[PDB]
Amino acid sequence: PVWRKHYITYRINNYTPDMNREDVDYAIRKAFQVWSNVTPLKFSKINTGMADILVVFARGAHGDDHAFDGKGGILAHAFGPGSGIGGDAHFDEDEFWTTHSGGTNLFLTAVHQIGHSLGLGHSSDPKAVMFPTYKYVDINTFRLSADDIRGIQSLYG
């Protein structure tokens, strides 16, 4: 399953205290952009009503039967295309979220999760944003690998 529309809405449910709000907004907006730049998908932030993709920062158990696990391990997770909890992207508030390096990078994590929120699975390329392991890469030279692009275009392009 994939989203059956190309106008897809998202909402930040709550903000991490780790970063300035302005920076959270910008990392999340840019991570949608990465995906809208190589597909016919249009992402729109809304500030009221029910969004397709709910962006949540939470720790431990948070109401969806996938409790987080403290610092380290699981950084985040996201549900595939679907109503209700589907698409929603959650970020483990026990991580330390940063604009750049020196904790866990929100932007990079967000691009990956948004990938799952759109229906992507994982990539065997360590250059892929959908690679299953987090590592800091240079955001300045960040670009989707060809594996990411073909995956997402097989879904939406």
Told to check if 11 binds Zn ion by CB under 5 A, we report no
Told to check if 90 binds Zn ion by CB under 5 A, we report yes
Output the smallest distance, CB 72 to ligand 67F, in A: 10
Cβ-based burial of 84 (10 A; exposed 0-12, middle 13-18, buried ≥19): exposed
Output the smallest distance, CB 103 to Ca ion, in A: 8
Q: Decide whether 25 or 64 has the Cβ nearer to Zn ion.
A: 64
**In what helix (H) or strand (E) does residue 56 lie, and over which residues does it extend?**
strand 53-58
Which residues lie closer than 8 Å to 142 by C-beta, 6 or more apart?
34, 108
Told to check if 147 binds Zn ion by CB under 5 A, we report no
Residue 5 and residue 64: Cα distance in Å, rounded?
25
Output the smallest distance, CB 109 to Zn ion, in A: 9
Note the residues at the interface with Ca ion (CB under 5 A): 18, 69, 73-74, 86-88, 92-93
Output the smallest distance, CB 68 to ligand 67F, in A: 9
Taking CB under 5 A as the criterion, which residues in 30-69 touch Zn ion? 64, 66
Note the residues at the interface with ligand 67F (CB under 6 A): 74-77, 108-109, 112-113, 116, 121-122, 129, 131-134
Q: Among Zn ion, Ca ion, ligand 67F, none, what binds residue 90 when CB lies within 5 to 8 Å by partner kind? A: Zn ion
Residue from 59, 60, 43 nearest 3 by CA: 43
CA distances to 50, 91, 93, 155 from 67, in Å: 23, 11, 12, 29
Q: Which DSSP symbol is given to 1?
A: -
Q: Give how many residues touch Zn ion by CB under 5 A.
A: 3
